[PDB]
């Protein structure tokens, strides 16, 4: 049926190495500080646009002392980013606003280029620091080595992006794996032309609308069309080349 898989860790490290051209090089989440979904939701609700981000239609659509200009100390301007970040402080009327994740602590993970080094190694990127016992007892795990060949790779998979970070899972539909979704969820690289820059904004827009509008699936009485067809004597079944079947589809439609 091909429904569940479970792999060993050398398999996952080989696949992770072979897939790296399509994968991100981020280890933590802080890159998406005001570029996450919740920031985009808040931004949409307030009718404000993060500079790389999508733009929508507005959701909401007298003389006074409180708003007076003689009383204002204009020290720095209030940017739009601040209003996304602390929405209840800088907005009168925040409706349908989402609070964003504040901070996650920095993953200080150290990549190893060369496999001949030990797994536990003081990398030069790290800043330098600066009664009797019985004869039977030993340290725990005295036989086992400290590291093996698999250790640096196994540590490397802890900080990998999904689905690499797992050992087992369900097989997924081929179409349901976009493979580029991460490229547009990051900032557009610098120096790109206007059409490409705009392109990034449109792809993010559709990403934000699918995430907003989603409601969980309604549990309905499924029906199977092809099983009903195969239950009849009028439909027979076989195994054909894809091109052969494709030609038949073309001929039959004509």
């Amino acid at each position: 049926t091909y429904q569940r898989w479970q792999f060993t860790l050398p398999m996952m490290s080989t696949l992770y190495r072979l897939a790296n051209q399509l994968l991100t090089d981020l280890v933590d989440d802080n890159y998406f500080y005001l570029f996450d979904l919740k920031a985009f939701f808040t931004s949409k609700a307030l009718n404000m646009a993060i500079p790389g981000g999508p733009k929508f239609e507005p959701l909401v659509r007298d003389w006074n002392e409180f708003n007076d200009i003689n009383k204002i100390i204009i020290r720095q301007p209030i940017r739009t980013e601040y209003k996304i970040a602390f929405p209840y402080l800088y907005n009168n009327l925040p409706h349908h606003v989402h609070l964003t994740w504040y901070h996650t602590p920095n993953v200080v993970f150290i990549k190893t280029e060369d496999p001949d080094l030990p797994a536990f190694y003081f990398d030069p990127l790290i800043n330098p620091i600066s009664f009797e016992l019985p004869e039977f007892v030993e340290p725990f795990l005295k036989d086992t080595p400290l590291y093996t060949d698999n250790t640096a790779n196994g540590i490397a998979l802890l900080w990998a992006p999904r689905p690499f970070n797992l050992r087992s899972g369900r097989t997924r539909r081929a179409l349901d794996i976009p493979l580029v979704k991460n490229w547009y969820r990051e900032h557009c690289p610098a120096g790109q032309p206007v059409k490409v820059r705009v392109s990034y904004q449109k792809l993010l827009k559709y990403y934000v609308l699918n995430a907003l509008k989603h409601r969980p699936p309604k549990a309905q009485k499924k029906r199977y069309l092809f099983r009903s067809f195969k239950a009849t004597k009028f439909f027979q079944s076989t195994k054909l080349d894809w091109v052969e079947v494709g030609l038949q589809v073309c001929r039959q439609g004509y």
């Binding site: 009718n47 404000m48 646009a49 500079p51 239609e57 507005p58 301007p77 940017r79 739009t80």
Partner: peptide
């Protein structure tokens, strides 16, 4: 609408809505 400047929607304006800063400020 970034920094309180611009059209909330460029739609029906007749234009693309591109906004740049004034370069001749003193």
């Amino acid at each position: 609408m970034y920094n309180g400047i611009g059209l909330p929607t460029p739609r029906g304006s007749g234009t693309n809505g591109y906004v740049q800063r004034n370069l001749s400020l003193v």
